[PDB]
Amino acid sequence: KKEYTGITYISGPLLFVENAKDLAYGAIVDIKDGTGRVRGGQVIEVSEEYAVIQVFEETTGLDLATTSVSLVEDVARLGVSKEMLGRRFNGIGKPIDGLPPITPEKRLPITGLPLNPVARRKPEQFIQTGISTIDVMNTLVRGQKLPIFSGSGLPANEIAAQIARQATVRPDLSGEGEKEEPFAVVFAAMGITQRELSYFIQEFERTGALSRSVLFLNKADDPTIERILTPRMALTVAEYLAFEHDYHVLVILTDMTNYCEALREIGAAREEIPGRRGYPGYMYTDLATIYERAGVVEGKKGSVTQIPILSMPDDDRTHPIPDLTGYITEGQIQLSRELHRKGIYPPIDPLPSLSRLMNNGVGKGKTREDHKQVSDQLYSAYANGVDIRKLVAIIGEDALTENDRRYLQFADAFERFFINQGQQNRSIEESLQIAWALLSMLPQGELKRISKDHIGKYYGQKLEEIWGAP
Amino acid sequence: LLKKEYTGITYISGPLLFVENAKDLAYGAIVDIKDGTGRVRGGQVIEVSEEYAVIQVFEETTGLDLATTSVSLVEDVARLGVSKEMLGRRFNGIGKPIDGLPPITPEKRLPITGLPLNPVARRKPEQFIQTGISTIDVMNTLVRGQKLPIFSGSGLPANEIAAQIARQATVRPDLSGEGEKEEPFAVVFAAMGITQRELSYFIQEFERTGALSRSVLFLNKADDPTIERILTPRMALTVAEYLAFEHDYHVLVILTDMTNYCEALREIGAAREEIPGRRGYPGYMYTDLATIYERAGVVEGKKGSVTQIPILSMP
Amino acid sequence: RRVNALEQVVIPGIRAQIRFIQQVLEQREREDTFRLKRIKGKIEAREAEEE
Amino acid sequence: MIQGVIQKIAGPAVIAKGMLGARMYDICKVGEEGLVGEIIRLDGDTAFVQVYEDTSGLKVGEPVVSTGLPLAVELGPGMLNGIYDGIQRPLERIREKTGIYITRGVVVHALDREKKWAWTPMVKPGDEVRGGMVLGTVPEFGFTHKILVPPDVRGRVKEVKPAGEYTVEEPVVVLEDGTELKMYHTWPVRRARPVQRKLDPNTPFLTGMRILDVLFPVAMGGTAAIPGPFGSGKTVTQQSLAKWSNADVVVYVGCGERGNEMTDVLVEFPELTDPKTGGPLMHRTVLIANTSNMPVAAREASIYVGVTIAEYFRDQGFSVALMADSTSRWAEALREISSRLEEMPAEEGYPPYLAARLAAFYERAGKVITLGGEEGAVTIVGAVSPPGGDMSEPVTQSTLRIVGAFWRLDASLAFRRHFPAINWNGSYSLFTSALDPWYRENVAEDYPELRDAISELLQREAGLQEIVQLVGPDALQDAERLVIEVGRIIREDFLQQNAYHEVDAYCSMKKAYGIMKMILAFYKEAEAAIKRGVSIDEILQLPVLERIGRARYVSEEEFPAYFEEAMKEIQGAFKALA
Amino acid sequence: PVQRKLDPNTPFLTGMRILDVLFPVAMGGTAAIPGPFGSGKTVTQQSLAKWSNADVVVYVGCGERGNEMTDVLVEFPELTDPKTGGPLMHRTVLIANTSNMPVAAREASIYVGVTIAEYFRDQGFSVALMADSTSRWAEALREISSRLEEMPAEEGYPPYLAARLAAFYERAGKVITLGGEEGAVTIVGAVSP
Amino acid sequence: PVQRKLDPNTPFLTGMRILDVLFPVAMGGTAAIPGPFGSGKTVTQQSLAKWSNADVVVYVGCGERGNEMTDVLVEFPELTDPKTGGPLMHRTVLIANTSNMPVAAREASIYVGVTIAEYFRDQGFSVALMADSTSRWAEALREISSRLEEMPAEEGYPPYLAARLAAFYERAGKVITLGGEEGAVTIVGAVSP
Ligand SMILES: Nc1ncnc2c1ncn2[C@@H]1O[C@H](COP(=O)(O)OP(=O)(O)OP(=O)(O)O)[C@@H](O)[C@H]1O
Ligand SMILES: Nc1ncnc2c1ncn2[C@@H]1O[C@H](COP(=O)(O)OP(=O)(O)OP(=O)(O)O)[C@@H](O)[C@H]1O
Ligand SMILES: Nc1ncnc2c1ncn2[C@@H]1O[C@H](COP(=O)(O)OP(=O)(O)O)[C@@H](O)[C@H]1O
Ligand SMILES: [Mg+2]
Ligand SMILES: [Mg+2]
Ligand SMILES: [Mg+2]
């Protein structure tokens, strides 16, 4: 209604408007010029004589004579509803599928309120992602923040799409059988290109997985403030669904490096002094307000699980973005360039990968009871094999003992069969059966980490039973 | 004596505060700051101009305001009261006794910065000091008037070596042929950045043998304000120079840790806000260290001497 | 002999080179922070102070 | 107090005008909602405040009201069995009125204002009192909480309330000058509480871990640091110290923890029991919890609140153990705060005054004579997490300069599942000589000789590592093979300890002394049998080796009979040989 | 403006074995070739302009040597088009802004070249766009930003540098034109760190 | 001022085998001797003062120890001039500014020493000028530029540091004086990195 015409300075992404002491901090405004085109803006500084507004998109058509500014909303809010399942959004809530806009049941602030530490409870249930190297050895637990570390040319988008397409819960293995649990996936993409957008749309729409998913998609040429606001909308939707309708949700953030670079650009544009290596000094706090919104709450049936994805700038783990992420999250999953160049997909290397909350979600009463010892034995045997392989290159294959040859064959068969699963969908029972078939190559009694009952019950199955469909 | 107070405080931020009408405050003067609650702090004028004078605070600025705060002048040049009765006493590196004894009555008041020695007035060092250590006394013997540091490490026992050198140091006139008369020997022990356990160890070590009767101790702890760490070695050097060049004493000065002094200097230097040096240390650190080490030596036509043994741990 | 030479010679030299490079990069970062502070101080000196 | 209005908002920094008379580092209530902040710059009629919470939605012209006091903590009855944040807010009482979230601007009190306490006065009218003495007692769980006059208050007693049920707000003692003394008082967290005299520590801080209290002990009142890489075992060791220490009061501080890791301790602790009296464990502990998403000001001031509470409990004659988990994440909060102030960072990005703050935190510990004439002690154990596992980090080097113990953790032992993964070569302790008189009056007269023999046996094995790297252990001579096998026996039977076992989680002094005696007796008998001349293969076959191996898992009150049987069993097995 | 984007499914043949086999580039994709001086960026880009299967080639010399432009102006009219048979210069458009030319015109040349390439895309052609160096564009942006008294990014560049580079590279792709035809633009950029 | 400058063709005999044989210096040349602490710069410079064939020796103690100055003050009158037979101090001019003296006077000492050395050159003598440390002059310039709130170039030094060093070292050489005689000045400066 009220329009301010006291524009006095336009330069780059900033403009000053005088006699605007009635605007609240952080408000959203609309900028209108003489041609009728309307742009969006946000207030970043309020003073007694002028206010500073950061403008989305370019400022080509603006002039100091005809420009006017009007107020939209004091706080950036999103209208959420259960009908948002099966829809796509552009990162600020505008649909991009051509369907009519949704009617909101409630309007919520995109900024988050911290959870009370005395209100949370310990995670105790696992999620079957369909990948053996994650389900068996790096188990994902409902309420965990388990990031994925990737490189430059590694296929992280394919892994993200496969996980979002194959994720499910298994109530038939938990307790007595339990009851049906609703499941949803919230997908957020930041700074993606047109090729990745088309790939994500084609992957989601070709198998009916869109009917249980919400998409927030942000392009690379979009304004950076929308990239900043992209994950918060997704986390607001996830929190609403989980803690108001008992949904078990899964949140995937496609590229946090783009978010960090956008944060750096915004901080530089607002005239602030950077900290370590040119990044803002409050990046640890800003990243913590995103990761720590996941978990499970005592007295509620829903849960929020986060799988952040970030790319190391130069395959360096001492970079600030991977270093601060490990200070907050509960482990990591690392992709391998050596496995990728050998034709192995997915190229997950289990030697540096680690899941902290694995022990709570596995054992008796929730998945099979021999999980932990099998995973430990597999890890130890692979660790032996990767050293015997490089000893072979110097001393030759005939200079070793027979058990070193067995370990080398185990390592080769492991890389060929367990990790290299392709586009299959493996249950936890199938993965455990393949793991036990791989452990039959090793002699009986050489498995120190496994008790005798499980060895008696499970050892002896041939590997060639997978030859029907390896 | 009359006192003058300035109430024109206009700006407080960090360690600095601005006083408006302080035209008569000389550069480098020492002031004291009194707040509404009556607590008194200390400061020094680092810049005085026509519009305002800049005073940095020795400690934190908690509780200061722009109404009840007043600034008064103590002295133009920082001075210390010295006496011959200070042998056998312990101080906190600023001049306050910590042994519980009544305070000393000064005979003279000397500036702690001192003055540079005339190179013509100097003479060459020519006599040695017996330290009781074979590797030192034979191969790298200490000479009266020399400055010979000890490069140590994190896990190495530098404190025990310092205590042993302080206990066993003596001057032997029987090997010189100038008569076996007594040449007075004193030890000045300055310790900064020293924890409570090391303080107890040093006090017990000095008290057990009886070497405290010929020594003056300046002890600065880690929790003390960082300005006392800066001012600790200058007071000890002032006392040593006074004793040596006014009472014919052969003094020995031991500085326990120069690394803590450099850390305190780096902490203080952020107030001036200049371009830093090699590893964040101030670019004037060479001059600041030279103003300390170059106060030792011997003077032509005088009997006394000053000897320094700095100790530092290489990072 | 090869094991002893590798464990006593090459690794400390590489480590010292790494330390030197890290110190140089840290000094450059400190200098650019100082430059940014000075240019911000010059920015506030004109718009917020002049008539 | 001074009231002003908002002039400019630029994020977390708000400029308030009309605030003449306000003091530096005071607490202000910003806006209509009542967000808290600190005054960091005074300039003319305006003041610069820094709001802790989110400033979105604020408008220019809203009132600003100062409190006139710096950051302080309410010290009095009702702090035990309580959960607090970094700025002393009860999280349980917040949840009862708000829900599962923490809304901005919520107002609560650190001490409950509606609970009645039993009052028993000790002073009488006409007495002369000074700071630090005792005015009365209050029963709190298993302790008798003493009511102390504040340290800066002195005067003459005018009127004393009689015995009865009073809240903390009732003035129990009113002095002659009009000053009213209540059950509680406030103390700034950045000012050390004064005492009379500091003393040398002479009693060991029993931990329950064998290697910690045997090889590298810490006296009661000293300081220790435990650095290590990821997965080394810092958190498990810290909570084991929380569970099994012999301290009267335990204060646990967590700065910048993860949500699920904080939830683990917040859940497991109410289910545990006190080893001394058998009651609930939470009846003796005070918990300070800060995950990564409360603001950086509460995370930075978390360790000073905890050390202030520990100093308050020290002044009543107790012995308090303070554990700070992951001070490296407190250094990150300090670095962020310094970055928001543009303070020209030192090497590795940290502010130049980091060492000063670390010294100020660690130098508040020690055994002292309180102002009330009683003896108290505070022991501080701090955990450090280096970024890449290297100990050249400025935080680690700053912590190494002042602590009296160093429990370094190694990643090599963690890979081989050797727990606790404490590198005994790289560790040290400066308290052995001080506690040497205490060991020979409470454990055994020859305990230091046994400890030195064990250390010498461990040192002899380390000098033989270059031999076993070339040739196999079997190729060694029998004399060297004996020390190799006894070193393996020591490593797998004395240093190894399981924190999750029913009985191996706690080990006393006498049990470890008996284990060392058995090991040394076996070594002497094996050396004698080698001197007569037998094959080493027959010695390693002896079934008495099983008895030493299972000596870890025998319970506490069955150990003397087991030790008595094993002491003669070793001799009986060794005489029945060539 | 366009009508609809398309998925990339046809390779862009360059004539170099390693680029065509090991690291292929699609007809609507984008590629980057960074390296130090004397490593062969200009030779590779000129070979791409000579031997590719694109209908129209647009070469943008943002802040580089004029001898290379003279080389292109002289040698190209004597060469043969691979798919037409006429002179090679009849399918090539050159935009030249050398290093001794004014600095502020470096930004405009890139936009002019990409606009011409988009115009030739709307007629149903396949257009190959070569940028000689975007580092010169970044250096020009840094030079202009000094006169505005701004607070810059990491290495003195303006904070809006990443937005311009993103907006430049998003103009490529295989589209369906407003006239119903099908065209594509492929961009090969060179970086001089 | 001078009339002409000539090519140096006679050696400056330092009396040290390694300097005189392997790496000689001429009668109008310049030399630099860098090294860490405790390497032998001061001993080499004092040996050059004692044993060289120069007629007049000018020694500048820019920011060094005072004991090294008292050594020259005491021991030199006892020694003998190698080429005249008189006392060694009768041909030596000493300029001293120790490390605890004011910093701003370090530059003035260097300029005074070089001006005196040029004055003795115009009378036909051969002069050897020795600067104890040129790093302290750079430190003084750094401090003065820091007081002037100037913009440092590298490690806090002013950008005009090389100009001052070039102007100082260019005053040496063998010349034909305005009176018609021949004179020469040699400069041997020490650097403490
Ligand atoms: N494919 C090739 N075959 C043969 N010679 C080549 C090839 N590529 C490069 N060269 C040689 O290497 C030289 C590299 O010069 P060129 O102009 O390609 O450098 P540039 O990498 O573009 O450098 P600048 O960044 O300085 O512009 C060429 O002049 C040529 O001599
Ligand atoms: N030619 C030499 N013959 C004998 N001893 C020498 C010689 N050169 C140096 N030394 C020894 O080495 C020491 C080096 O001292 P000197 O004053 O020359 O060092 P410097 O390089 O000037 O160091 P600084 O930078 O610390 O002043 C001498 O005091 C002397 O003991
Ligand atoms: N004394 C012990 N007994 C058994 N397991 C241990 C012991 N100490 C550590 N561990 C194992 O090592 C792991 C260490 O992780 P944790 O201590 O939580 O974090 P960090 O070691 O990185 O600080 C734990 O998961 C635990 O299972
Ligand atoms: Mg931990
Ligand atoms: Mg080129
Ligand atoms: Mg020298």
Q: In this structure, how is the largest beta sheet of chain A organized? A: 9 strands, mixed
Measured between the Cα atoms of the first and last residue of chain C, the distance is: 78 Å
Radius of gyration of chain C: 22 Å
What assembly state would you assign to the polypeptide chains in this entry?
part of a larger assembly
The main sheet of chain C comes to: none
Number of distinct helices of chain A: 13
PDB class: motor protein
Keywords: ATP synthase, V ATPase, V1 ATPase, motor protein
Entry title: Cryo-EM structure of the V1 domain of V/A-ATPase in liposomes under pmf condition, state1N
Chains A, B: V-type ATP synthase beta chain
Summarize the structure.
The structure is cut from a larger assembly and holds two copies of chain A, one copy of chain C (51 residues) and three copies of chain D. Chain A is α/β, with parallel strands linked by helices and 470 residues long.
Task: Provide a descriptive summary of the structure in words.
The structure is cut from a larger assembly and holds two copies of chain A, one copy of chain C (51 residues) and three copies of chain D. Chain A has helices at 132-135, 156-166, 194-205, 224-245, 256-269, 283-291, 320-328, 337-341, 358-361, 371-395, 402-419, 428-439, 452-458; strands at 3-4, 7-11, 14-18, 28-32, 38-46, 50-55, 68-73, 77-80, 87-89, 106-109, 126-127, 140-141, 148-150, 183-192, 213-219, 248-253, 295-296, 303-311, 331-334, 354-355. Chain A has 470 residues and is of the alpha/beta class. The longest helix of chain A has 25 residues, at 371-395. The relative contact order of chain A is 0.12. Chain C has 51 residues and is mostly helical. In chain C, 90% of the residues lie in helices and 0% in strands. The termini of chain C are far apart. Chain D starts with a strand and ends with a helix. Chain D folds into four domains: 1-71, no CATH class; 72-114 and 182-429, no CATH class; 115-181, no CATH class; 430-577, no CATH class. The chains are: A alpha/beta (470), C mainly alpha (51), D alpha+beta (578). Chains in contact: A-C, A-D, A-E, B-C, B-D, B-F, C-D, C-E, C-F. Chains C and D meet through helix 1 of C and loops of D. Strand 2 (9-13) of chain B pairs antiparallel with strand 4 of chain D. One magnesium ion is lined by residues 41-42 of chain E. One magnesium ion binds next to helix 3 of chain D. Chain A: Belongs to the ATPase alpha/beta chains family.
